[PDB]
Amino acid sequence: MSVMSYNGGAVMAMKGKNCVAIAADRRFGIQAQMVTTDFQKIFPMGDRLYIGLAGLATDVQTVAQRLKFRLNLYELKEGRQIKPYTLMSMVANLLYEKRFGPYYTEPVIAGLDPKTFKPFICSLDLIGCPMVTDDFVVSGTCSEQMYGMCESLWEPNMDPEHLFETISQAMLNAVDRDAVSGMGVIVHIIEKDKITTRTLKARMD
Amino acid sequence: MAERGYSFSLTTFSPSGKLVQIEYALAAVAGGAPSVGIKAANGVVLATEKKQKSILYDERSVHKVEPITKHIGLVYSGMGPDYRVLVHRARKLAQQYYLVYQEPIPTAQLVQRVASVMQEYTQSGGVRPFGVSLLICGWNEGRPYLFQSDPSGAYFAWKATAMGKNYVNGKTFLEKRYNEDLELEDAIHTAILTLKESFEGQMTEDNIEVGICNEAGFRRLTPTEVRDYLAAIA
Amino acid sequence: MSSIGTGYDLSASTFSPDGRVFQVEYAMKAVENSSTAIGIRCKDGVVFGVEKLVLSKLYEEGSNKRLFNVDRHVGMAVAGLLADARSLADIAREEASNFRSNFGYNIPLKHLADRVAMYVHAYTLYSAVRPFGCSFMLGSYSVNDGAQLYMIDPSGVSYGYWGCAIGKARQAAKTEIEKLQMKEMTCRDVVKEVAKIIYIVHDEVKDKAFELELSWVGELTKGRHEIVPKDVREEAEKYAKESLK
Amino acid sequence: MSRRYDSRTTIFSPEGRLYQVEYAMEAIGHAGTCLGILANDGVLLAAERRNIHKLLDEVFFSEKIYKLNEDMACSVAGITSDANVLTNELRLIAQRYLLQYQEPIPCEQLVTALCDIKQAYTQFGGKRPFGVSLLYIGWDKHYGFQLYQSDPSGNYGGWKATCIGNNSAAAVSMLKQDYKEGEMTLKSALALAVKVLNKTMDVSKLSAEKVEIATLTRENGKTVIRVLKQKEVEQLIKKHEEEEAKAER
Amino acid sequence: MSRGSSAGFDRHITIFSPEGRLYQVEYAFKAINQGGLTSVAVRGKDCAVIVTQKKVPDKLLDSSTVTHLFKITENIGCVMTGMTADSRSQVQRARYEAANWKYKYGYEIPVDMLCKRIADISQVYTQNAEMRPLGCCMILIGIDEEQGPQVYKCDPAGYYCGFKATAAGVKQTESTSFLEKKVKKKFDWTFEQTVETAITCLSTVLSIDFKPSEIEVGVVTVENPKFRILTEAEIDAHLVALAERD
Amino acid sequence: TQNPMVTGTSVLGVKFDCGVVIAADMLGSYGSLARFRNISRIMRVNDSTMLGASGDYADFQYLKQVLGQMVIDEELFGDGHSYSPRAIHSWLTRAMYSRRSKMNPLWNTKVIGGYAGGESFLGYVDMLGVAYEAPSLATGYGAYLAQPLLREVLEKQPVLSQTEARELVERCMRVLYYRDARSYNRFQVATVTEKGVEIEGPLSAQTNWDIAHMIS
Amino acid sequence: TTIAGVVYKDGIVLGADTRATEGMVVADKNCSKIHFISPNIYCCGAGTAADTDMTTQLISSNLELHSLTTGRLPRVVTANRMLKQMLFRYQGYIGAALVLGGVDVTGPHLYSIYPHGSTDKLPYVTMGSGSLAAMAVFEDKFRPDMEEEEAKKLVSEAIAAGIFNDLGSGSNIDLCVISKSKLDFLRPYSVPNKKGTRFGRYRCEKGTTAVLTEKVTPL
Amino acid sequence: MEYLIGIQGPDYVLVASDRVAASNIVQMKDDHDKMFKMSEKILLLCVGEAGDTVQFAEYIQKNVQLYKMRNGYELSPTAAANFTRRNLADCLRSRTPYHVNLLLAGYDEHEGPALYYMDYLAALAKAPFAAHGYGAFLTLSILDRYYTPTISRERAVELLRKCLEELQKRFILNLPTFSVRVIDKDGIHNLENITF
Amino acid sequence: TTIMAVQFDGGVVLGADSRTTTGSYIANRVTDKLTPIHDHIFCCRSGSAADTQAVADAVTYQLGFHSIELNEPPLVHTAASLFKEMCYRYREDLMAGIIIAGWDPQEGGQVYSVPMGGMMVRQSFAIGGSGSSYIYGYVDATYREGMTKDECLQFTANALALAMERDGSSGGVIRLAAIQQSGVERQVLLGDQIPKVTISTL
C-alpha cells in the first residue's frame, strides 16, 4: 500500500469484509505527475495462492516488497505441509517493514487474504513502523488513508451476500475516483472467497 | 596471539550414506542417558534419566528437562556441554521466529537450523560434531509433534523413539507399541513405563525427570508428581 | 618430569596423556639450566638482583639484560631462555601502557599476575605459538597497594611471594630467605641480603665472570623502577663478598 | 602432529584428482534416490526418504524434497546432514534472484552458481565437499521445462530424465526406457516416478511414509510448487501398479 | 576406558572414538590428578560450603592467588580443582564472561545461570583441539535467590547438574560415596554443622587430616549472601567443636 | 581568552627558560567555568624522575595530554636500558597527534611546557593542541598569549639573559592582573621549577592582590 | 496511541492503558491490545511512539527468557533495563520508546521506566507519555500510604479513563494488566464503558454508480 | 515530465527510437554526435537517458554482469528480466537521496515468448507498453500517439511522425538539439536510420 | 539537574542529593534513587539528567567488576573515576552531567574524587557539583571547614539538599541522602512531604 506520499506513484485501495470472503478494490492505472506507463497493471499478488498482498506507489517498489515478503514466507511454507495462515502473514509483512532503520519501507503494506484452507476473513492495514496492529474490522489504505476508509467502513455488513459486496466495491472505486484529482485509468475488483479469486476488470478509458 | 592446528578434513566418506566419524558419535548417544519420548496425541510427553549415576541428585532447576519457550521443551541423551549450547541457541532461534511470526519456532524448522551447525562441525577440520541427539516436542499446526535430530545432523521422524542404553532395541519396542488418544494423566503413566523398559536400576523421583507439553504450555513436572505416576502402573 | 621428544609435542595444540604438556615441561628445564635471578619483597619496596653475563670487556648495559621495567614502576626479572623473555617483555610493556591510559594509577600487581599467567597459559593452548621458556618475577612499590612480589612460571600459575629466587638451585635459596625476617628489615637492609645469595647459588659451567646488576623500587626512587642508588649499591657489594668468606 | 597425515583434501593425489571428491560419490550410492522426469506442461521430482524406519510422524514433510521457492524445487541424494546446510542456502538464493529477476528462476543458472560453492571447499578452505548431489527442477522461459543435476565435484548436467542417489546407472536407463524425449505427460509421468522408486531402494517396500512426490505444474498465471500429501501419493502408488504393465506392453 | 582407534586422525585430535570418548577431555581428567587438589562440597539450607586444600611449596607466600577460592561474582563463589595453571586461565575467562553478564543482566546472577554460561564457553574448548580444553574442575557454591543454597559441579568438559552434595579432584567416585553416607545421615543444617560435616569428609577420604590454616572454607550463608572466606579464626571455631563432636 | 571549547580551565602558565632551569608559575585556582571549583590544585605532573610537565589551557584536555605523555616515558623505560626521555621527542610525538585531533569536532589549543635535560640533550619545548611546537626562550599560549606573553617577550628581546629572580617578581605582578581581569580565578599560585636532574614544586600557597585603581 | 500508567498497591504492578492501535493518527483498530506480554510474566505499558517500544521490548523478551528457563526464578527486570540502555546510548538518541517495564524479580520487586535516552535509576511508580500527569492525578487522590490489589485495580481503571478523555486516539475499554511473580492477566475487557461499533442503519448504493464488464477466476 | 528527453514507440512488429546526442558542457556541444544508444547485443538495445555521465557508469557495470549470464549458459539470457533486474538494484539505491536514477528504455528480443520492451522511469517503474518516452519527450508525444496512429502503425507514418516530433523539439522546446539519431527496428534487429 | 554533593569526614563519606528525574518540563518520576546499582560495593552520587549519568555508571560497573575480583574485593577510587572520564571525553559539551564519586579504596584512607563532564579526574577535599552547583555554591562553602566532622556532616549535608529542592526549579520533594562506607552503600530518606521550608521572603 502506501501512507507515504509520492508524486511519482500514488494509488488507492479500499477493502470491505463479508464473512467468508473479503474484497479488495484497487485502481489499475499508474501515474507519476504528468506520466503514465500502462493502461492496466497488477498490484495485489499471490505467493501461495488465493491470498493477496498489495504494494502501491510506483511499480518497482510494488514488485520489491512482494518478492521480499515471499522470502520470509517460504520457510514456513516448506516446514509445514499446510500453507501459511493469515495470522503468520500479518506479522511477516510487518517484519519486512520493520527490517529498515529510521527511513522505513518504500511502500506501506495493507494485507488482505482468507486463512488457508478455511473460510476465516482477514483485513489489516499497517503503518510503515513496527507498530503492531490486529485488525479484522475494515481497512482502507493509501496516502489519503481517511478517504479510502470512510467509504469502505460505510458500505458493508459483517455478513452480506458476496455479490452485494462486489457491486458495492465497483461503486466504491467510482466515488473514490471522483474524490481524487484524476487518478483512475481502469478499475479492478478482487473478491477472495475460499480457494477462488474473482477478478473483475470494470469499464472505462 | 593466533592458533592453527588441524584445518584439513578429518572426516572421510564411508559407503553407508554417512561418514565414519559421525557413525561413531551415534554410539556415544547410545552409551548416553536413557531418554524416552512418546507423542500422546494431545500433547507430547518427554522423560529423561535425571541421574548421571552418582545417585546424589538434588534438582530444582538444574534439569535435563528444559523449556526453551512457550511450547517447546528439549530432553537429550549424550553430552552435557554440547547440549547447553543447543539450549542457548534454541531460545535465540525460537525468539528469532517469535519476532517475525509472533509465534515461536515450529518443530520442523527448529530442526533444520540446529542440524546445519551439527554438520558444520563435521566437514570442517579442528572441530568435531555434537555428541547429542534431541527429542524435540512442540504443538504446531493444531497437532503435537515429536522429532528426532541425531548427532550427525540427519533427522528421522518419530511418533515414539527411545535413546540411551539399549536404544536400538528401544526403537523397535516403540514402533510396535506407540499409542495415541491418551488423556494427560495417562500420558505420564505410559511414558514412565516406557522409561522403566529403557532405564535400569532404581527409579524414585531423583532418578527420573518428566516434562509435558500440551495446550496450556510446556512445563516441567514436580518431583512429587512423577512418583505418583510411577507407582500407579505395571 | 615427563616428556619424550617423539609423541605429544609434535604440534603446540597437542595435549599430553599425563595432564601436563611436554612442551611446558621443556620450558621449565631451560629455566633450571640458567643463572640465578632473585627478587625479595621488603616492607618499603622490592629489591631485584639479576646477574648480567660478561663474556667480553667490550660489553655495556644492554648486553645480556634480565631487568626490564614492564611499566615504569613495575619491574620484571627473568631467568631461562632470554629470547622468549624479551619478547614477553614487549607485549607486557604494551599491556601495561594501555592499562595506564585507561585506569590512570600505579597498577596493582595482583591484577597483573592473573592476566599474565593466563597469557602464558594461552601460548600452551594455541598452535601458532609455543610456551614461554622463562619464569619470571614481577615486582613493584606503589602507594595503592604497597610492595608486591609475584612469580609466574612458564606453566601459567601465578602465586604470591614474600621473597622468591629462581636459578640452578631454587630450593636452597628459598630456605635462606626463610631464615631471615624481612619483617625486621626495611628496604635498605634487603639490598645487602639479595646480593650474597646470587654469588653462592650460581655454579659456573657456562659463565666466566658476571656482573651483578640490581634495581630499586623503593624509598630512594619514589614508586618508579630505577637502577639502584650508589650508596645502596656499595653497602650491598661489600656484604656479598664478606658472606663468601 | 598434522604434518605426517594424508587425506589429500586440497592436495592433488597420484590420480591427478583428490580422494575426498571421489569418496563423496560412494556415500551417495547407499543413500535414498531422487529422480526428476520431464512432462509437456510441467516437471516433477520423486524421492525416496533417508528414513527406512516403519514409523514416521511427518513433522517435516520435506525430508528429501524441499520446495525452495514458488518457482523451484529440490531433492537430496546423499546424507541428510550436509543437505540441511545446503537447504538454507537455497531458500536465500532462489528468492534473491527472483526479487531482481521477476521471472521464474532458470534451472541452469541455479546449479552452476551452487556447483561453484561445492568446488570451492574441496580446492580451498580445508573443508570436504558436501556429500550431497541436489537434483533441481524448475522452469524458465528460454530453455523451457528443465531438470538439472548437481554434484560435489562441481559437475552440472542438463537433463530431461535422470536419477542420482542409489543404483543410479540402472535408474537413468530405466527412466530412458519408459520415457523417451518429450513423450509422457505430467500425470502419467508421476506414475513412472514411483515405479522406478519401488525397484530401486536401499531397503525394499515402497510406502507412503518412504516416498515424497512433488509437482511443478504451471497453473493459471502462476507456476505452482506443491509437495503432495501422503494421501495423494497413495493414489499414485496404485497408479504405479498400473504403470508396470503399461511400460512392458 | 578406551584410548580409541583412529579412522580419521583421531590420535592427537578430540574427534570421536567408538566409546564416544574425546581424547583431549580424557587427558583433561589427568590434569586434575597433576594438581593434587581435591574438594568436598556440601549443600544445606543454612549455607553452601566448599572446602579444599591450599598448596604450600614454601612459607613465603602471599595469599591473593595462592588461594583456590575465587570470587566469580560477589554473592556466588567457587573453587577450581586440579592443575593450578589451567585453573588460572579458566578463572580469567570466566570473570570477563561474568562481567559481560553484569552488563546484560544488570545484577547478582543465579547459580544455575552462572554454571550455564561457563558450560557454553567450555563447549568451545571441548569441540576444538586448536586450543585444548582447560583441565580444571569448578564447583560453584552460592545461594540461589529463592531456592536456597546450591552446590553444582562442572567438569573440564562442562557437564553440570544439581546434586545433594558433590566432590571434585583426584578421584571423584571414591569421595562421592564417602559423602553419600554423610548425605543419608542428613544432619540438622545450621552453620556449625554444615561446615563441620564438609570438613570431616575431606579429612576422612585423605587420611592425612589437617589444621584449619591448611584448608580454606568458603561459605555463602543466609546470614550475609556475600561470598565470604572464613579465615584462620573462624574455621578454628568449627575444628575445636568438631573434636568434642563424635 | 583565545580558547575555543573549554570548560574546566587552567588559566595561565608562565614559562621562561634560564640557564639550566625553567620557572613555571601556574595558579592553584582551577575554574570549572566562572566558578573556582578547586582553590588549590597542583597542575604539575611528573612525566619522569628526570623530566617535568606544567600545563595551561583547559584542564580536561591536559589530563588527556598527561595519559599520552605518560606512556611515552613508559616506552623508554620499557626497553630495559632504563633511559629517561629527551624533551624534544615526547613533546614532538604528541604535536602530531594534535594535527589529527583537529578534524574531529573536539578542539585543542592545549599548552604544555616541557623543560628537560635527559640522555645528554637539553631541550626547552612548548607543545600545542594546534601543534605549534618549537624550541624557545620564553613561551606561553592560549590565555597566556593574550595578556602576559607580550610584556614577557618585550623584556626578553633586548635582554635575552633574564634570570629566574627578575622573572619571579614579574610572575607575581602578572598574576595580580589575572585575579582582577580573568573570571577563571582569584589568585593563589603554585611555583614549579623544572631541572634537568629532578622535578621540583612547592605546593600551592595563597597570594593576594594590591589595590590602586580607584584613585582617579 | 499509547499512554500508559501504573500503580503500586505495595506489591508489584497493575499496569493500565486505554486500547486503540493507530495507523499514524488514523485508527487502524478501534480497540485491540497495546499493553503487551513479552513471553509469560513481564508486561510493558507504553507511551510516546508505540513503535520503538515494541521492538526493544521484543529483544529483551528474548534475553529474559534465557534467564527464566535455566533458573526457574522470576523474570529479570534489570536484564531488560540494561539491553534498552545499551541500544539508546550509542547514537545518543535512536527512536523514542517510553516504557513501563514491570515484573517481580527473583529477589526484590523491580519496576523500571525507560525513557527515550538511557537511565539506570529505580522508582516504584511511574506514569508515562506527555499525559503522565493525568494518570498520576488519579493515584494521588485515591492512594494514600498502602493500597491493596482490588483498590489498585480501581485507581488503574481510573487512570485509563482519564487518557481516553484527554486524547481521543486512546478510546473505549480500560485494560488492566496484573503482573506478579507468577500470575499474569491479559483479558482485553476489564471495563466496557464505550465501544466502537458498526451502524444500525444501512445505506450504500448498488448499481447506480457501479461499473463492471469482465470477469475471470484465477487461483 | 522528468529529466532529459528520449522517445521510443513499439508497434509490436516495428520499434521506432530516437535519442538526443548531446553531452553538453556549458553552452556548446563539444561534439555533435554523442552515444546514448548502447548496444549490449545486436538483438538487445538499451537507450539510457538522464545525466550524461550517470548513464554511462550504470550501463557498464550491468553490461559486464549481462555478459556473465551469456558466458555461462551460451544461449540468450532473459533480456526482459535483466532490464528489470538492474531496476531492482536501482530500487535499493533509491532509498538513499543520491541521484543515480536513470530513465531507461529497453528494447530486447527474447526467444520462446517473443519481443519485450520495458519502460523505466526515474521514479523507477517497469511497464510493458504501447509507447513511452522519458523526460520532456514523454510529454511531447504521448498525447498525439492515441490520436494520429495505432500501435500497429506503418513504418512510413511512424517515421514522418518522428521527424515532425524532433522538429517540434527545436521549434517549441528549450532543449533543442540539431543532431538527433534515429534508428528503426524491424521485428529482430537494429537498422541505423538517417540522422536529422 | 538536581544537586550532588559529598562532604569529607576522614574515613567514610556523606553525600546528599535531591530527587526528581525529569522528562523535560514535566518531572516524570520523584520516587526514584539517586544511588542506584553502580557495582555492589562502590557509590556514586547522581542527579543531573538520567542519560548523562547512566552511560558512565554502567561502564564503571563493568570495568569495576573486573577490578574488584582480580585485586581482591575492594576497587580503587582513582580507577573508577577515569572510566567515567572516557564517556565524557566523546560527549564533551554534549552532556552537562558531572558525577560525584566518593569511596574508601584499599589505596589508603578516605578520598573524594570529582569526575567532570569535560574528562577531568581529581582527588580533592569536598566539592558539590551539578549544573545547578553554580547556584548552591555559597551554601556548601560555609558548611565546608577543615575536617568537617561526621555528626556535623549529617546536618550540613541534608540542609544543602533541602536548600536545593525548595529553591530549585529543577528540584523536587524529598532529599534522598547517601552515606558510603566499606560495608556497602546506604541510603536514608529525609522527608519533605511533611512541611520543611527554607524561610520565605517578604
Short mmCIF file of C-alpha atoms in Angstrom, two decimals, chain C residues 99 103 105 108 111 114-115, chain E residues 70-78 90-110 114 117-118 140 226-227, chain G residues 82, chain I residues 37-43 56-77 79-81 83-84 103 106:
data_model
loop_
_atom_site.label_atom_id
_atom_site.label_comp_id
_atom_site.label_asym_id
_atom_site.label_seq_id
_atom_site.Cartn_x
_atom_site.Cartn_y
_atom_site.Cartn_z
CA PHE C 99 46.23 -0.06 31.37
CA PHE C 103 42.91 3.27 34.52
CA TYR C 105 47.01 4.80 38.53
CA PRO C 108 48.15 -3.21 41.36
CA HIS C 111 45.67 -7.88 38.68
CA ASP C 114 46.38 -13.12 36.93
CA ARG C 115 46.31 -11.56 33.34
CA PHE E 70 37.86 -17.29 43.87
CA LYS E 71 35.20 -14.57 43.68
CA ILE E 72 33.38 -15.20 40.44
CA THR E 73 30.77 -12.67 41.49
CA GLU E 74 30.13 -11.06 44.89
CA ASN E 75 27.32 -13.36 46.06
CA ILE E 76 28.16 -16.66 44.33
CA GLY E 77 31.73 -18.15 44.84
CA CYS E 78 33.65 -21.02 43.61
CA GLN E 90 39.77 -20.57 33.28
CA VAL E 91 39.06 -18.18 36.17
CA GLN E 92 40.33 -15.41 33.93
CA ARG E 93 37.99 -16.30 31.06
CA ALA E 94 35.08 -16.77 33.30
CA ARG E 95 35.45 -13.34 35.04
CA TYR E 96 35.35 -11.49 31.65
CA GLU E 97 32.20 -13.56 30.84
CA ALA E 98 30.82 -12.80 34.37
CA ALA E 99 31.36 -9.07 33.89
CA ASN E 100 29.59 -9.42 30.49
CA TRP E 101 26.62 -10.88 32.38
CA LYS E 102 26.81 -7.87 34.63
CA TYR E 103 26.37 -5.57 31.60
CA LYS E 104 23.50 -7.69 30.24
CA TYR E 105 21.62 -8.91 33.41
CA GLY E 106 22.35 -5.83 35.48
CA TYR E 107 22.53 -7.73 38.89
CA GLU E 108 23.63 -10.69 41.02
CA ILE E 109 23.47 -13.83 38.91
CA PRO E 110 21.59 -17.11 39.88
CA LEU E 114 26.41 -18.85 36.26
CA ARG E 117 27.47 -19.57 30.87
CA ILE E 118 30.80 -21.26 31.86
CA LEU E 140 30.17 -23.42 42.23
CA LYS E 226 28.04 -12.25 50.33
CA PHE E 227 30.67 -14.74 49.45
CA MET G 82 20.21 -2.90 30.55
CA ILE I 37 23.44 -0.17 41.47
CA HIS I 38 26.80 1.05 40.16
CA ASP I 39 28.65 -2.02 41.34
CA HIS I 40 27.94 -3.82 44.56
CA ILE I 41 30.40 -2.05 46.94
CA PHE I 42 31.03 1.37 45.22
CA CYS I 43 28.83 4.52 45.35
CA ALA I 56 29.06 6.37 32.63
CA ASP I 57 27.54 4.48 35.63
CA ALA I 58 27.29 1.27 33.55
CA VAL I 59 30.76 1.33 32.01
CA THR I 60 32.23 1.74 35.59
CA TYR I 61 30.13 -1.22 36.78
CA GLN I 62 31.61 -3.33 34.03
CA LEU I 63 35.29 -2.22 34.45
CA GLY I 64 34.81 -2.18 38.35
CA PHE I 65 33.61 -5.70 38.08
CA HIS I 66 36.91 -6.81 36.55
CA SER I 67 38.91 -4.73 39.08
CA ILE I 68 37.30 -5.97 42.21
CA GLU I 69 37.79 -9.74 41.55
CA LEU I 70 41.40 -9.71 40.47
CA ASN I 71 42.71 -7.26 43.14
CA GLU I 72 40.69 -8.84 45.98
CA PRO I 73 37.26 -7.47 46.68
CA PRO I 74 37.53 -3.53 47.06
CA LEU I 75 38.42 -1.47 43.90
CA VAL I 76 40.39 1.77 43.61
CA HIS I 77 38.59 5.18 43.61
CA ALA I 79 40.43 3.76 38.66
CA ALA I 80 36.71 4.07 38.81
CA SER I 81 36.54 7.82 38.14
CA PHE I 83 36.26 5.12 33.34
CA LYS I 84 33.54 7.88 33.66
CA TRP I 103 34.75 5.92 48.36
CA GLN I 106 42.49 -0.14 49.59
#
